[model samples]
Target: MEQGICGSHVFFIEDGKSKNYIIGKYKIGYLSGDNLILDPYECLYLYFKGRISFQNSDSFRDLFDTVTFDRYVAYEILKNKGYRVKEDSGLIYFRKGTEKPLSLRVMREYDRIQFSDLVENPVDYYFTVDEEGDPTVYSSQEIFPGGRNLVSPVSAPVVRMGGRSFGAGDLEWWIGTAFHGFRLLTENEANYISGNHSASQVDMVYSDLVGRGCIVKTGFKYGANFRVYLGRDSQHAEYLVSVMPEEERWYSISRGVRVASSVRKTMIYASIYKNEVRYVALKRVKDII
Candidate 1:
């Protein structure tokens, strides 16, 4: 394979690959360690100018067209975080930027892990995590169909840190869209967000908690939690959710809900990133219009 070097990073042309195999200023490599310059193999493509083996190339390629192409860090972000990163047809993996392998069992209950804490609590698991960093078999958790949590327990709610939630959406959008983001964004983008991911999840959530004039307030102290207020209205309750950093956006433990009635109050049930959240609606409740 004909090869060239920008620096420590090598860009070579395999036995019969195209020229400029390492042209311009971009890092490229195949993880498969194939000799063919253009040996269309799956690998990580180097994004930044640096030294890496054929494996790095494999990683870069898995992400996008060129390595130095902003996406370099993106892929690294995921790899560094220890996520099961891959790029077949497109980017697809368990998490965005972490190597924390999403076990097959966890994969089966992707929705629950991303949204609820049912296994922890049958009454208000409205999505609770082991604040004490206690560990548990994810598969053991029971998923409450249609049940939601508006509040999140403070501390190592799972203390199990992983990737970031890197997109924008509403509550319902969050639940239905996160996986899509997993399927949509390039490995790089996904990786970046998965780690230092943060967004105005409250804005998306506000759209759901507002209107009822729910007075956003802290009724119960779960732990150190941040909240936003909108005031009471038709629902006669507080329109607020404990928005905290989960993966991408400020996620509330539960889907902050304000029942339509005389006195409104904050009720958390489900959590999600902004982009992934879709407009939400309560059963028999005409809150979202």
Candidate 2:
């Protein structure tokens, strides 16, 4: 194995034959004048592959002291898959054989994500590593659920608490179940007509979705907060939505997206950030090739 000096920004190789071998064969790092310089990910990768060692015997372990472990996990996966990996303005991005690059954001499955974070930092790919070091990738997009406008819940209805569902007197609308002559209301539906609204994050999302002429219903069975229908006569809901809190983790988000896709419905997240209600859909990224 050849040797290199580790620096704050890069691992330094001064006119070494091993530099050419590593660069030419694996495309690990770039040449700056007569020397080759490797970033944290590049240098650690070569070390793990047994292609090179640092001046300090355990400097390889020191690499993780500054950067996060999941970050290296993401970089290593990209490198092994033959993608050109590089850092851009503090984020890791990769390019395939083609020239175009995909900007990526990596996170741990247990990390708490704010909805505002999704809006401010958008990406082509969102990678998450779970507790068992399993990786899952997702793509995000802002979707506009459109369709034939349905009759709104014009008047506030009286709600009574019950175990199976809430009890409501017969109404003019059809968003509830026909329990004999009276209508049955789910938790979400009961909340909508409780007179006091927008007091919680879930209520905020429900109001916005309903205002768009969407038929919003309880998504309790789908492992989410609400299931949204676009058209009045549509047989199925188009999206599964969850009212996310600051303490919510990525693993649960990943699960929701997977289950929603399994049922042919898009998984969406709703939350209030900076006094604004935002909706973000999580779409799976299967292949980058």
Candidate 3:
């Protein structure tokens, strides 16, 4: 099937017929086999409801009679007028005609499909601009205990990480529009909106606590944690830091006492094997605390 065919764009369909087509069904003067033509909004409603293929809208437009105008031109005109996929009352909605210019803050519901390209192709988002005025490829460091930059994962180190550990060594942290941590996980701020799974697990409802100067990181491993870097060999050395007195201590079954440290640039809270952590936080150097 071609790109815009109903067959090519049907993600979901009920027995013997597409929902859009079925709803479009109507009495025809002795023409029983002629399926009713679905309205544009009806087709769109199904698409956004997940009852239609991702490209169903395009498929719908493809069926338009082009004797009066070019298909691509009409599509461009409609899209430029702000026609987009939408949902309402368990149906997909496609709005056409004049579009009111929306304020920058106007709220609308949307499932950001952009996230698919981001997580599935992270390099597309987190790369440096090379000298050629183009993005450069980069790989993230494997983060966890016992990797090149190792940390003691046996116990949940009190990080000022002032929350419950969802599990051992897990630290929860919050990210927001202006936060670097948030930017690391998302290329666009919209990607972290409510209902977005990749959004920070931290409870945004308690964001007031963070604004009140409270240390908001939790002791859990949904991948929000910090590392105490002793020092780095390269240009990062200027930011070298060590753990403070009493902060270097670890808690366990209380078998004995253990101190964790590593060579220069040792990642004290890195994700070792089986975990992929590119984002890490580190504090300044200090006496073992």
Clashes per model (N, Cα, C within 3 A)? 92, 0, 25
Candidate with the larger lDDT of 1 and 2: 2
Clashes of 1: 92
My TM-score estimates for the predictions, one after another, are: 0.24, 0.80, 0.16
Residue by residue across 1-289, what tens digits does model 2's lDDT show? 3344445533434335567787888887666665577777787787677666566656767887665678888888898999989876657888887787889988666677777777776467888777788777888776666646565555566556456444445553655788766678766666676644666778777877877788888899999988888876779988898988876787788899889999999999888777877788898877952
> Using lDDT as the measure, which candidate wins?
2
> In candidate 3, what are the lDDT values of residues 50-110, reduced to their tens digit?
4445334456555333211222222223343445423232222234335532111101112
Off by over 4 Å in 1: 1-70, 88-213, 216-289
Q: What does the lDDT come to for candidate 3?
A: 0.26
**Model 1, C-alpha of 81: deviation from truth (Å):** 3.2
Ten residues in a row with the worst lDDT in model 1?
Answer: 152-161
lDDT of each: 0.31, 0.74, 0.26
- Residue-level lDDT tens digits of model 1 in 205-282: 433332232222233343312132442123332322344345422122222332321234333333453454432212
Ranking by TM-score: 2, 1, 3
